[PDB]
Amino acid sequence: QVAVLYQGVNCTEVPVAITWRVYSTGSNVFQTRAGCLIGAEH
Amino acid sequence: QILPDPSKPSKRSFIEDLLFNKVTLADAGFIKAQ
Ligand SMILES: *[C@@H]1O[C@H](CO)[C@@H](O)[C@H](O)[C@H]1NC(C)=O
């Protein structure tokens, strides 16, 4: 299992990142000053 | 003058405030001239 950090992004535009898109389902997307973290529970 | 000052958002002393004002950062960077 893994989590993904898109660094330097206000993740309102990441839902469409661009290959793999398994993780965007989320339901636990979280916003940090370093970027947006997907796949981790706060 | 060196112990914390509870009346600030950051619990910094007096001299620490002076020091943080004397130095002016350039192109610091945050979550967003670059
Ligand atoms: C991220 O974007 C939303 C709307 O696109 C905005 O309301 C929010 O303030 C932005 N984040 C920051 C840290 O400004």
From Swiss-Prot, chain A:
- State the superkingdom: Viruses
Q: Spell out the residue ranges making up region: Disordered.
A: 15-27
Q: Where are glycans found on this sequence?
A: N10
Q: Impact of altering A40V?
A: In strain: 19B/501Y
Spell out the disulfide connections: C11-C36
Cite the record's note on assembly.
Binds to host ACE2. RBD also interacts with the N-linked glycan on 'Asn-90' of ACE2. Cleavage of S generates a polybasic C-terminal sequence on S1 that binds to host Neuropilin-1 (NRP1) and Neuropilin-2 (NRP2) receptors. Interacts with host integrin alpha-5/beta-1 (ITGA5:ITGB1) and with ACE2 in complex with integrin alpha-5/beta-1 (ITGA5:ITGB1). May interact via cytoplasmic c-terminus with M protein. May interact (via N-terminus) with host bilirubin and biliverdin, thereby preventing antibody binding to the SARS-CoV-2 spike NTD via an allosteric mechanism.
Please describe what this protein does. Attaches the virion to the cell membrane by interacting with host receptor, initiating the infection. The major receptor is host ACE2. When S2/S2' has been cleaved, binding to the receptor triggers direct fusion at the cell membrane. When S2/S2' has not been cleaved, binding to the receptor results in internalization of the virus by endocytosis using host TFRC and GRM2 and leading to fusion of the virion membrane with the host endosomal membrane. Alternatively, may use NRP1/NRP2 and integrin as entry receptors.
Protein name per its UniProtKB record: Spike protein S1
Q: Which taxonomic lineage does the organism of this UniProt entry have? A: Viruses, Riboviria, Orthornavirae, Pisuviricota, Pisoniviricetes
Shown stretch of the complete protein: 607 to 655 of 1273
